Structure formats: structure tokens, C-alpha cells
Amino acid sequence: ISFRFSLDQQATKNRLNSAVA
Amino acid sequence: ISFRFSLDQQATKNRLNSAVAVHGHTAEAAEWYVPPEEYPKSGGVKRYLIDASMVPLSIMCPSYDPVEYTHPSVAAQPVWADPADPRKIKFNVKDEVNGKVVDRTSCHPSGISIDSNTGRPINPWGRTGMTGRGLLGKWGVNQAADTVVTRWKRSPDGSILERDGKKVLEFVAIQRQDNKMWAIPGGFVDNGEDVALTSGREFMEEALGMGSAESKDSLAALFSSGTIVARIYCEDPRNTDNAWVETTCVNFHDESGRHAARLKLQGGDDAEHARWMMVHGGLNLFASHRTLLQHVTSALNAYF
Amino acid sequence: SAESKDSLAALFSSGTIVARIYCEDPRNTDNAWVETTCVNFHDES
Amino acid sequence: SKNGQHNEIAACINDNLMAAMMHNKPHFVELYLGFDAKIYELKPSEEV
Amino acid sequence: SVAAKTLLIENEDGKGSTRMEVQDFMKRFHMHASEDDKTGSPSTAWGTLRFPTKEATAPYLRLSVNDDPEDALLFVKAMLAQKYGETYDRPSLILSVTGGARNFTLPPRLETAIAKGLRLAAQRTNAWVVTGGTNTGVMKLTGQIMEALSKTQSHFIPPTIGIATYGVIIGGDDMTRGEPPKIGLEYEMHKKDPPKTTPLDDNHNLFLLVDDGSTNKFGKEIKFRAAFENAAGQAFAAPVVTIVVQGGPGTLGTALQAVRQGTPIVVVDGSGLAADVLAYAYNFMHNPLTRFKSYTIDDLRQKVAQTFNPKSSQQLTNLLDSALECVQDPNLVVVYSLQESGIDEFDDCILKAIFSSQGKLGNKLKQAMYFDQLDVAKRALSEA
Numbered sequence: 073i074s075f076r077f078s079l080d081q082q083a084t085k086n087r088l089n090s091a092v093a
Numbered sequence: 094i095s096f097r098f099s100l101d102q103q104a105t106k107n108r109l110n111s112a113v114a115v116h117g118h119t120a121e122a123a124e125w126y127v128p129p130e131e132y133p134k135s136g137g138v139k140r141y142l143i144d145a146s147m148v149p150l151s152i153m154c155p156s157y158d159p160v161e162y163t164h165p166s167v168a169a170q171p172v173w174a175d176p177a178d179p180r181k182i183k184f185n186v187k188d189e190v191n192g193k194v195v196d197r198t199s200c201h202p203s204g205i206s207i208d209s210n211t212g213r214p215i216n217p218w219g220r221t222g223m224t225g226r227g228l229l230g231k232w233g234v235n236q237a238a239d240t241v242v243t244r245w246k247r248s249p250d251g252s253i254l255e256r257d258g259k260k261v262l263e264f265v266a267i268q269r270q271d272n273k274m275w276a277i278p279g280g281f282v283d284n285g286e287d288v289a290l291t292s293g294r295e296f297m298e299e300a301l302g303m304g305s306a307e308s309k310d311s312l313a314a315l316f317s318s319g320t321i322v323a324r325i326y327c328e329d330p331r332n333t334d335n336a337w338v339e340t341t342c343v344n345f346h347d348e349s350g351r352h353a354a355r356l357k358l359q360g361g362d363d364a365e366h367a368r369w370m371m372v373h374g375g376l377n378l379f380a381s382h383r384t385l386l387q388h389v390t391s392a393l394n395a396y397f
Numbered sequence: 398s399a400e401s402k403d404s405l406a407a408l409f410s411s412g413t414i415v416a417r418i419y420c421e422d423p424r425n426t427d428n429a430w431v432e433t434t435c436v437n438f439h440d441e442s
Numbered sequence: 443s444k445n446g447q448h449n450e451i452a453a454c455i456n457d458n459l460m461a462a463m464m465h466n467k468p469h470f471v472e473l474y475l476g477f478d479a480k481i482y483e484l485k486p487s488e489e490v
Numbered sequence: 491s492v493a494a495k496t497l498l499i500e501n502e503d504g505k506g507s508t509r510m511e512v513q514d515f516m517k518r519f520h521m522h523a524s525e526d527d528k529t530g531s532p533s534t535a536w537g538t539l540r541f542p543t544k545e546a547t548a549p550y551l552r553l554s555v556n557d558d559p560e561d562a563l564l565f566v567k568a569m570l571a572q573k574y575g576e577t578y579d580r581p582s583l584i585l586s587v588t589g590g591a592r593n594f595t596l597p598p599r600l601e602t603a604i605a606k607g608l609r610l611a612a613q614r615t616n617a618w619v620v621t622g623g624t625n626t627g628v629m630k631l632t633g634q635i636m637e638a639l640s641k642t643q644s645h646f647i648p649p650t651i652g653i654a655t656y657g658v659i660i661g662g663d664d665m666t667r668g669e670p671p672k673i674g675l676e677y678e679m680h681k682k683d684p685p686k687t688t689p690l691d692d693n694h695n696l697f698l699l700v701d702d703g704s705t706n707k708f709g710k711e712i713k714f715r716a717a718f719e720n721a722a723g724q725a726f727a728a729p730v731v732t733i734v735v736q737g738g739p740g741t742l743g744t745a746l747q748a749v750r751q752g753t754p755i756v757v758v759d760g761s762g763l764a765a766d767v768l769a770y771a772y773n774f775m776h777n778p779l780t781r782f783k784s785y786t787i788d789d790l791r792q793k794v795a796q797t798f799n800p801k802s803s804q805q806l807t808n809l810l811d812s813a814l815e816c817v818q819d820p821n822l823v824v825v826y827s828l829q830e831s832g833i834d835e836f837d838d839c840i841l842k843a844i845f846s847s848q849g850k851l852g853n854k855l856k857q858a859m860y861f862d863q864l865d866v867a868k869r870a871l872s873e874a
């Protein structure tokens with residue numbers, strides 16, 4: 073699982089800020 | 094085996110199209126959008142039917158007699174509705190109505206051309222067999238903002254689901270009150286406000302039914318990283334020749350999945366039910382939301 | 398072959414011209430020779 | 443059975459079951475029974 | 491064969507209420523003289539039918555599609571309360587068997603495995619089995635299963651409710667014409683009736699005929715059937731489990747309504763068509779295993795097109811959309827593969843569907859006690 077998590081974050085990795093809503 | 098498949102697709106990953114040898118008569122691209130004959134919520138009012146090979150303004154089309162229809166709700170002049178005499182209004186630039194800014198600029202490269210006879214703008218995207226405003230309150234471009242809040246579709250083991258060699262997305266979808274079709278949360282831009290506030294406000298109103306302390310802060314963390322993925326013309330059935338919906342799409346992606354998990358989905362305002370739904374190319378959604386989902390998977394290199 | 402025919406069309410939607418070379422064909426003469434354009438249709442999945 | 447070749451199973455099951463009875467292999471007689479071995483469709487090797 | 495004059499209908503909040511006359515109760519049921527009619531007229535087609543070679547008689551009630559399923563649930567409760575007394579055995583399980591009617595041509599080995607598993611499950615849990623009312627296919631098979639149940643279990647016999655569309659029964663008119671109560675009406679499957687051709691199965695104990703005024707148009711009971719089962723499940727605080735074997739377009743609609751009404755489904759993979767499509771769709775949308783990574787929307791569409799022959803791209807799109815809508819919630823669908831498993835894994839799949847419900851904890855533990863799976867009860871108790 074540790075390897076699955078590690079491979080998953082190595083493969084899944086106009087700027088708007090909507091925090092005012 | 095899962096690891097072997099994963100390493101295999103990470104290592105195996107003049108342009109010529111030979112499909113004419115297979116089919117024989119290619120029927121082009123997706124052609125041009127034609128809205129349905131019955132206008133929604135109008136009591137049996139029918140448009141003027143036109144073939145898809147005749148919609149564009151470059152094509153002449155001398156046989157054109159559209160019907161002028163405006164909905165009673167719009168004709169009662171609500172705060173969000175423009176005046177019935179659409180003169181005295183500047184299009185293609187940011188216009189101030191009652192001291193509040195409204196966008197009014199279209200994403201079409203040519204721009205909006207103004208008719209001399211009635212002062213009413215004419216839709217560049219192409220005819221629809223109906224003049225007047227219909228169910229839309231504003232003349233010309235009704236700017237809508239859509240909120241695609243996404244997370245990776247994960248199985249319990251924690252592993253991300255993978256289809257066709259790409260990672261699978263998951264988005265929040267609402268069931269509309271008017272036509273009972275699933276859709277992306279979003280709505281028309283209010284006066285004096287921008288797309289950021291509109292996108293966020295409509296997502297809380299529709300998919301969360303708000304109106305939570307640290308959980309609220311968590312939601313703020315989710316909305317601190319948004320990317321405008323597309324600004325396109327909607328294939329919305331309420332569109333007419335003098336009022337059409339154009340959307341700016343904002344994608345809020347949760348890479349870890351922590352912030353997405355704190356959302357207690359419960360339909361409110363103009364939504365019946367809200368749920369997490371897998372993104373794929375066979376979805377039957379309202380208007381041109383499949384194109385919006387195509388744009389978010391294109392940006393995130395996800396399955397579609 | 399209906400949808401299978403469509404599948405074949407999907408296969409032929411992505412082709413790359415890899416080479417345009419002179420053939421070492423035994424029927425070649427001094428006044429007529431075969432030259433090939435090679436098209437590769439690769440199926441990744 | 444999974445690949446739709448049930449007809450070929452049924453065409454050869456009687457003689458194969460017969461051979462299994464002749465050569466004293468009980469485990470093979472059960473195996474065959476359930477995959478359409480009809481005990482009443484047996485045929486003699488010679489003609490009486 | 492003395493006709494009943496008063497009936498005991500249970501109250502909405504207490505145990506049971508006062509006995510009152512049959513016509514007063516039977517005013518809650520409507521019939522349509524034609525398709526055009528919406529408000530309707532009083533039904534008057536309710537009583538008992540006598541089938542050849544069957545000792546006991548079966549009650550039947552014809553009601554409309556817009557009629558409340560709670561009223562039909564009272565009808566079932568009132569008949570059982572009349573026949574077996576007030577303290578009859580309450581159900582701890584409603585087991586719905588749906589699937590292929592005329593297109594149920596299944597290899598014998600599988601048919602024996604499905605029959606054996608269904609016989610083992612229903613017997614052990616005294617389940618109320620709700621199928622279609624017809625004498626065709628898997629319903630007939632289920633009827634045969636319950637036939638063995640009828641020659642045992644001492645006094646009390648669990649009802650085998652058959653819900654059928656009125657307008658498909660070769661003897662429907664005889665049931666309607668007459669005075670409102672009919673006690674010994676004989677059912678003739680071999681009689682040559684002109685419009686319809688589908689007879690009612692003789693092994694079903696009660697019958698609900700859903701009427702919409704149409705003739706020779708099936709598909710009019712799916713919603714009622716799902717709504718009734720849901721109403722029955724809420725009233726006796728018992729989980730409802732739908733089983734999908736083979737299938738055709740209405741089985742897909744049955745599964746769609748069942749998952750829409752919150753009722754869990756058990757799809758037997760390898761048993762046929764609308765089951766292979768449903769199993770393929772779930773496995774595509776939810777299963778993280780390696781062999782299901784090549785599953786695509788295109789192959790699913792190809793499978794639907796080869797198996798239900800929709801004619802129109804729009805029909806194919808609607809069937810595909812409905813199939814994808816059925817497997818939206820991963821908790822409500824449990825897929826048992828026939829060719830890749832064991833005899834007791836089917837009872838594990840049925841038990842998984844039972845626990846898959848939301849709040850009926852006492853009944854789910856009772857189902858776990860019947861199937862002799864202490865671990866499911868423990869793991870569940872520890873998690874709770």
C-alpha cells in the first residue's frame with residue numbers, strides 16, 4: 073500500500089481565489 | 094499486477110487520418126447545435142424549426158420567420174432583469190447598471206453586432222428560431238459561472254481507480270428543479286459581483302444548501318486553488334437570438350481528497366439532489382456540461 | 398462489422414508517417430522503380 | 443462450458459463416460475455427471 | 491366457502507384496529523376502463539382464484555398504477571390476518587426475484603445452482619418472495635422453488651406475491667365481470683383468449699394486478715412493485731433484497747426503480763443479459779481490480795446494442811444512461827459471479843445486500859443468525 077500511495081502522489085502531481093464566498 | 098500495469102503505461106507513453114478507407118463517406122465533425130422545438134416552461138409555445146446545416150450567420154437563409162416570445166416572469170421586470178427597450182446599453186464592454194458592474198462581453202472572436210432596427214443584440218453563435226429574451230433576464234450575454242469541484246475516485250484501499258490507462262475523476266452533480274436532468278452547479282452572475290463570488294456562492298447554495306467553523310475553513314482551503322478551465326458558449330435550450338448563456342468554468346480540484354470529504358451534500362435552492370458522480374464520456378447531462386467535463390479532464394490528464 | 402468497423406476506424410485515426418524510402422524490390426528496373434511511404438498505426442492499449 | 447462449446451461436450455460425453463466406466467475411474471464418472479452426461483444415452487461399441 | 495363480510499385492517503400507528511365491512515375498505519382501489527381515463531372508476535375485481543391441481547386458493551386484487559402501495563400492503567396484511575389469525579409470523583426478509591420472462595433460456599447447470607441457492611436462502615429465512623405474476627421464465631422457476639416450500643413448513647406458509655400488469659392476463663375480464671367479491675373463480679391457462687397470451691402462474695399465493703387502461707403493453711408495474719416492496723420493508727422494519735437473473739429491458743427498469751427507492755440489488759453475473767450489462771457497469775464504475783482496467787463506455791454500449799437491440803440511438807442512450815444510473819451507488823449493488831464462485835458465497839452476497847441497508851439492525855442480525863455467519867454479525871456489531 074505504501075508503494076501504491078507513493079506512485080499515486082508521484083503521478084497525480086487563470087488562478088482564481090473564491091474564499092470571499 | 095496493478096504495479097506492472099502502472100509501470101507499463103508510464104513507460105509506453107506526419108500525422109495521417111486513414112478513417113476514409115474504413116467509412117467511405119465521413120459525415121464531418123459534430124456540426125452545429127440546434128435547440129429543441131418546445132421552449133422549457135412556456136406552456137406549449139413552439140419555435141421556428143431549422144435544420145442544423147442552416148444555423149450559422151455566414152449562411153444566407155432568406156426563409157426565416159422566428160417567433161417573438163418573452164416569459165411572464167421576465168416581463169414582470171425583476172431586479173436581475175434588463176429593461177424591455179434594450180436601447181441605451183453598451184455591449185462588448187463592462188457596463189454599469191444602477192452603479193453595479195455587469196460583464197456583457199462575449200467569447201466569440203468577431204464580437205456582438207448590434208441590429209439597427211430594434212437595438213436588440215443578435216447572437217453570433219447562430220440562429221435558434223426565436224427572438225426576444227425568453228426565460229433569460231438580460232439582453233445579450235447572460236454570463237453564467239459553473240463550479241466543477243473534483244476529486245480522484247478512490248476505492249476503500251485508498252488506491253485511485255484507473256480506466257483506459259488514465260486516472261478517474263469524480264465531480265459534484267446536482268439534479269435541476271426545472272427539467273430533472275443532472276448538471277454542474279452554477280448560476281447567472283449577479284450585479285456588481287465577479288465570477289469568483291458567483292461560482293462559490295452558487296456551489297454553497299445548490300450543492301450544500303447553505304443559507305461550520307473549522308470545516309468552513311476547510312471549504313475555504315478547497316476554494317483557495319481554482320483554475321479557469323474554459324469560457325465557452327452554452328448549448329442551453331432557453332437560448333434565443335437576443336439572449337444567450339455563456340459560461341466561465343471554474344475547477345476546484347482536491348489532490349489529497351481531505352477537503353472534498355468534509356462536504357455534507359444536500360440539495361437546496363434550485364437543486365433537488367446532489368451527489369458525487371464519475372466523469373466519463375457517456376454522461377447525459379444538461380446543456381454543454383459534457384464539454385466542460387472534457388475541458389477539466391483535458392486540464393487534469395484524466396479519463397473521458 | 399458495425400461497431401467493430403468503428404473500432405478499426407479508431408485504430409486508423411492515429412497514424413504517423415515514419416519513413417519515405419526507396420524499396421529494394423526485385424521487380425525494379427532502370428525506368429520503373431518502387432518507392433514506399435510507410436504509415437505506422439500503433440495500438441498502445 | 444464458459445466459451446459456448448456445450449454442443450461438443452454433449453456429443454462426446456456418452457462415449458467418454460462409457461470409457462470412464464470401463465477403465466474404473468470413479469472420479470471421472472462424477473466429473474462428467476452434471477455436464478449433461480445422460481446415463482440413458484450410452485451406446486455399445488459393437489453391434490449385437 | 492362462506493364469503494367474508496368484515497375484515498380486520500391494521501391501524502397506521504397501533505397493532506391492529508377495528509373490524510369493518512369489505513366494501514368500505516375496497517373503495518380505495520381503482521380501475522381504468524380505457525387508457526385515457528385518469529381519475530377512474532371503482533375496481534370490483536378482488537377475491538380468490540382456484541387453479542387446477544392446487545389445494546389452496548390465491549387472493550387477487552386489481553388496482554390502478556396511481557393508487558397508493560400502502561393500501562395494497564394493508565390488503566396483504568388483512569388477508570393474512572384473516573386466514574392465519576392476528577398473531578401471524580411477521581417477515582424478517584422480503585426477497586424479490588426479477589428477470590427474464592420469455593427470453594429465459596438458461597443452461598441447466600446454472601439453473602440448478604440458482605434454484606438450489608434460492609431454495610436454501612428462502613427456506614432458512616421464511617422470506618416473502620415478490621416476483622411477477624406470470625407463468626413464464628424465472629418467476630415460474632421461483633414458483634417451482636416455492637412449490638417445495640408449500641409441501642412443508644407446517645401451518646404457516648410465507649406468501650409468494652405475484653405483481654402483474656392487468657391487460658396481459660388471458661382471463662382478466664372474467665376476474666373483473668361480476669359482483670365485487672368472488673371466492674371460487676377458476677383460472678384457465680389453456681383457454682384461448684384473443685388479445686392477450688400470458689397466463690398467471692399457479693404457484694403464487696397472492697396477486698396484485700396493476701392497471702393503466704392499456705392492452706398488451708407490459709412495463710406498467712415496475713414503479714408500484716418497487717414502491718410496494720419499499721413500503722413493506724419500512725412497515726415490518728425488514729431489508730428488501732432484489733435478485734437479477736438474466737433479464738431484458740423491464741428488468742433494467744426494475745433494478746433502476748429498486749436502486750432509486752433505496753432497495754439493494756444482487757446481480758448474478760454470468761446468468762445472462764441485463765445481468766451481464768449490470769455487472770459490467772458496476773465493475774467498470776467501482777471495482778479496483780486489474781482485470782477491470784480495460785473496461786470502457788464503448789464496450790458497454792456495444793454490449794447493450796448487441797443484447798437489447800434498441801433500434802434508435804436515443805433508445806440506446808436512454809438504456810445506457812439507465813444502466814449507469816443503477817450502479818451509481820456502490821453499496822446498493824452486490825455482484826455474485828456464477829462461474830467463479832461457491833455454493834455459500836451466494837448466501838454471503840445475499841447477506842451483504844441485507845447488511846448494505848441503513849437502519850434495520852435487529853432484522854439484519856436475525857438474517858445473519860439464519861445463514862449461520864457469526865462473523866458478519868460480529869464485524870457489524872463491532873463497527874456499530
Ligand SMILES: Nc1ncnc2c1ncn2[C@@H]1O[C@H](COP(=O)(O)OP(=O)(O)OC[C@H]2O[C@@H](O)[C@H](O)[C@@H]2O)[C@@H](O)[C@H]1O
Nearest residue numbers: 173228229230231235237239279280281327329338363380
Ligand atoms: N440573467 C438571468 N437570467 C435568467 N435568470 C436569472 C438571471 N439572473 C438571475 N436569475 C434567476 O436565477 C434563477 C436560476 O437559478 P440560478 O441557480 O441562478 O441559475 P441556474 O439556472 O441554476 O444556472 C443556469 C445554468 O445554465 C447553464 O447554461 C449554466 O451552466 C448554468 O449552470 C432563475 O429562476 C432566475 O430567477
Ligand SMILES: Nc1ncnc2c1ncn2[C@@H]1O[C@H](COP(=O)(O)OP(=O)(O)OC[C@H]2O[C@@H](O)[C@H](O)[C@@H]2O)[C@@H](O)[C@H]1O
Nearest residue numbers: 588589590591592593594622624626708737738739740741
Ligand atoms: N412480466 C412479464 N411476463 C411475461 N412476459 C413479459 C413480461 N414482461 C415482458 N414480457 C414479454 O416478454 C418478452 C421478452 O421479455 P424478457 O426480456 O424475457 O423479460 P423482461 O423484458 O425483462 O421483462 C421484465 C419484467 O419481468 C419481470 O421479472 C419484471 O417484473 C419486469 O417487469 C417481451 O417481448 C415482452 O412482450
Ligand SMILES: [Mg+2]
Nearest residue numbers: 278279280363
Ligand atoms: Mg444551477
Ligand SMILES: [Mg+2]
Nearest residue numbers: 280281283295
Ligand atoms: Mg443566483
Ligand SMILES: [Mg+2]
Nearest residue numbers: 280295298362
Ligand atoms: Mg441561485
